[PDB]
Design a protein around this nucleic acid. Sequence first.
RNA 1: GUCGACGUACUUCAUAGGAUCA
RNA 2: AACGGGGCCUUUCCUUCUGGCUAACCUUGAGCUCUUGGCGAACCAGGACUUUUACUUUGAAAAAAUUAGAGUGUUCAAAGCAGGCGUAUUGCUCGAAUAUAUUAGCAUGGAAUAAUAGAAUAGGACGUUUGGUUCUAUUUUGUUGGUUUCUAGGACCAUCGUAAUGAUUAAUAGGGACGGUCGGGGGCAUCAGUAUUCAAUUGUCAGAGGUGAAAUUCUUGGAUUUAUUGAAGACUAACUACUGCGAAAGCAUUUGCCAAGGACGUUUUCAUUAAUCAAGAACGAAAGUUAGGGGAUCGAAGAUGAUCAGAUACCGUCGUAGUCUUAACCAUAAACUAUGCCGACUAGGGAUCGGGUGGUGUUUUUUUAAUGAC
RNA 3: GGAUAGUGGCCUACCAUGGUUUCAACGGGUAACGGGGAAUAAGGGUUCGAUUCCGGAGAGGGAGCCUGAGAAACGGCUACCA
Lengths: 44, 79, 150, 134, 129
Amino acid sequence: GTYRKRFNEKARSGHMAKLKELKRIRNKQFTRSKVSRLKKKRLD
Amino acid sequence: VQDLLHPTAASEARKHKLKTLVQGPRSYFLDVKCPGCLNITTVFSHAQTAVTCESCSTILCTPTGGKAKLSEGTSFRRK
Amino acid sequence: GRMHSAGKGISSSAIPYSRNAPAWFKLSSESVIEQIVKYARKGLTPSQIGVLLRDAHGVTQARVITGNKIMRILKSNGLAPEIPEDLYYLIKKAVSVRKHLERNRKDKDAKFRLILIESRIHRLARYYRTVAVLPPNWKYESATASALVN
Amino acid sequence: GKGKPRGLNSARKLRVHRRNNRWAENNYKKRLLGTAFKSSPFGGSSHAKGIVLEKLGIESKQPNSAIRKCVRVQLIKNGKKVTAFVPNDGCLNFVDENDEVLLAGFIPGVRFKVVKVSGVSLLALWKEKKEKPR
Amino acid sequence: TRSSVLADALNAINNAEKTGKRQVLIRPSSKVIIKFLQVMQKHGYIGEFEYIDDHRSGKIVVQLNGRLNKCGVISPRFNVKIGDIEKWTANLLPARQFGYVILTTSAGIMDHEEARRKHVSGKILGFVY
RNA sequence: GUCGACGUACUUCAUAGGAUCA
RNA sequence: AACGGGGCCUUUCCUUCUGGCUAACCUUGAGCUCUUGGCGAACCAGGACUUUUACUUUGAAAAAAUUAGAGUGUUCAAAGCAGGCGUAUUGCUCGAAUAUAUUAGCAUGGAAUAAUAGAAUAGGACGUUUGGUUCUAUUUUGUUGGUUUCUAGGACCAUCGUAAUGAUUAAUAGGGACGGUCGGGGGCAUCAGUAUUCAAUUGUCAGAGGUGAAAUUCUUGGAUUUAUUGAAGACUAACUACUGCGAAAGCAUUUGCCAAGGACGUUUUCAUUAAUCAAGAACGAAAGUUAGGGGAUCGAAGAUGAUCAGAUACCGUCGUAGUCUUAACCAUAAACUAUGCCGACUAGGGAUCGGGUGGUGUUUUUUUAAUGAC
RNA sequence: GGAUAGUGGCCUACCAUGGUUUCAACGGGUAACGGGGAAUAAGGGUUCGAUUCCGGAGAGGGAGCCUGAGAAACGGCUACCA
Ligand SMILES: [Mg+2]
Ligand SMILES: [Mg+2]
Ligand SMILES: [Mg+2]
Ligand SMILES: [Mg+2]
Ligand SMILES: [Mg+2]
Ligand SMILES: [Mg+2]
Ligand SMILES: [Mg+2]
Ligand SMILES: [Mg+2]
Ligand SMILES: [Mg+2]
Ligand SMILES: [Mg+2]
Ligand SMILES: [Mg+2]
Ligand SMILES: [Mg+2]
Ligand SMILES: [Mg+2]
Ligand SMILES: [Mg+2]
Ligand SMILES: [Mg+2]
Ligand SMILES: [Mg+2]
Ligand SMILES: [Mg+2]
Ligand SMILES: [Mg+2]
Ligand SMILES: [Mg+2]
Ligand SMILES: [Zn+2]
């Protein structure tokens, strides 16, 4: 529920900002399309 | 058929020491008379030590797997 | 029944029912105590004293004759092992095994038995620490265990 | 011992053991992970919309045959082509190429039946109570 | 290792009844065992029994008359409220008045009917029927 | 690319036994 | 007569101080009741004094609505909390009950079951013992302040006395010690056995080898076979048995050293130290990898002869890696009793392995005997 | 010490090195507002509860305020994002 996809993320940019901050604090311990990915793999 | 409260004496005698109605030792103590000084020494039947007569320092018994073997020539009585 | 083994033996000593001294026993309760102290002064452990008294003096059981256990009689008279008798012997056995291993590094069997003995020391040492017989900061460390057994 | 703890203070072990094991059920796993609709014929829906491609049994000689009542329909949601039944050849007159048809679960291999065509119930058309809007 | 001596005693009694023996030996003894056997004796399921003292936990010899269908222990000793007794009687007994569910309540060890009469409750030790 | 492994969803093959009668 | 609830007595009463009331008991007097004057138990209130819980009983609390449920002819009913009885006149009157609600918190009766603490270097309990060194301070100090006296109380240190002065068994639980054994248990050295291959010498002369028959192969420079030796590396036949040992994998020549172990015997010792076990650790057949050593046999891979004949249909020859070993990796088996560990109980029989007890048993010790073997 | 109506690392300065955790902390998911309640069931249980009552939070998304006993109010105000 915290980081679920929203219908219009652009209309609530500020809200999104908070979430990012929260993640950066929550997951600080760790930090310390299909077609696109397949295209990169095949190009390599 | 047998009565557990009043077992037969022979029946209890056959059983293991710990398996009788009231467990108790099957060992005993002996008065061993030294051949030389004729004094009496108390010796355990299953003695694990080479009991020596204090006055004469003579070997009275030798340890074995079970009952100790009394030295030859030593008279004994059950105490 | 055996811990650290599959055996189930039941060989044990069967205390007699009667809790009084034998009728054929005609020695004072005091005189036994000096015998216990004299042997303890000679250095014998409580187990070895009881064998001598029982074998060669007719003392069926120290508690029955004197009313107190051998270890208690020794402690009352100022004779007290620095560490309990059984824990002393477990440490002694482990030291001998370690002395065997250092020469024989392929003796995987002795390597296994050393673990069983040490795991037996820790369980026994854990018991004494709880009762306060052994100081709470007491650890069996492999290197200096030779000092304790001396 | 039955292989389970029975001590009076062993509630935690019983709870934790149960929770780990409920994941063995396929019913539980599907229910929690929300994958119970992969097996559903319509992918979670009770009805599906489709486009009538062709009437395969229009030409079959024997009237009211099982083949005569089949219509080849393209599912709009994913574009996969499937076969659907019509109640009878009399109803097959109403269905023609390139109409939206609402399909429902039902010659083996045909698992769908048409319930509406062009937003009107076939049974309503068959009973002469409505006209198909075009 | 021995966890419940009462379980061992009741199992020995059941096996002896099964084999048709007229008397059974129970080792070790205990206060709980003696009170359980006294409840059974009061209700007639067992006969005279004699406690043998050997300066250890002790032993018992129980006379059997063949009237005992089953005796068992409920382990762990669940805490039973007054409302919960009837559930236990339904679960353990083949019928309503066929047998007794024995409880260790704060007034002693007793059958469930005595508990209901005295309006007490406690832990559950076992059953006899 | 009618590619491999896995996951998921399905399909399918293994049912007759005793007695009497003709 | 059964069932339950209270009191006493039985070696069994919480202790102490203060206060309130006052029973009963002694007594005077007036008729079991009043009354004089003492004594004041019990009970109540408070201050000190105080092992802690688990469990269960009872009481409060857990909003209303909802659920169950009492009453009531909403015309019946779902419902609602209404309503009912007289009446010319003024009016009377019953309800809107009751139960349930887990856990936590609170008060309360139990004292079974399960824990917890206490007296062991006594640093222990008690007191109308006796002394101190301290702190506190009501009243009488007219009043206030300061000091002192006596006195009271709290603590502390000694002293004396009182006391049955203070430590549960010793589990056919566990550990440790001791005694004589037992084992193809383990490590390190050491000894031997033929056998295989190869090499030297030796006598002889046409084949040897393998096929269902052949052929690659060796062979008059002497093959195969024979005898006397020597070298190398593995492996321990027969005895050998689901018998013995080890936690499992596994372990088989002699002798020595090192430590380890089960069972048995014990009127020895400690006294719950125990069972099962995520985490974590030791070992783990065969094959396999890294770096040395070795390299006899057999032998994945590779090569090569023959490719005819179905019971002998995959056979032959050379043989790399491997097989062996040292120092490390790998951690898998039908790693099988397709069968968790601990503990208790439930039939008889005779065989075997280790220990122990008993015999007036056979044999040996060929002097007895004692041992050993049966 | 400051600030608050007031306790408080709530903030500041100086100090120590502490606090939680296999009895599951911390991190992640939640088609997570919580409860009274609803359904099913013989009993244990399992699931549902945005939704007539209670309590919490929000007024497109962040942030900050005036007034007032009471608001970080949005059918009040100011900025930024769409
Ligand atoms: Mg023992
Ligand atoms: Mg069982
Ligand atoms: Mg409660
Ligand atoms: Mg014991
Ligand atoms: Mg053998
Ligand atoms: Mg042993
Ligand atoms: Mg390893
Ligand atoms: Mg190599
Ligand atoms: Mg095997
Ligand atoms: Mg078993
Ligand atoms: Mg700061
Ligand atoms: Mg929810
Ligand atoms: Mg949500
Ligand atoms: Mg809700
Ligand atoms: Mg708001
Ligand atoms: Mg909107
Ligand atoms: Mg706002
Ligand atoms: Mg608006
Ligand atoms: Mg508003
Ligand atoms: Zn002599």
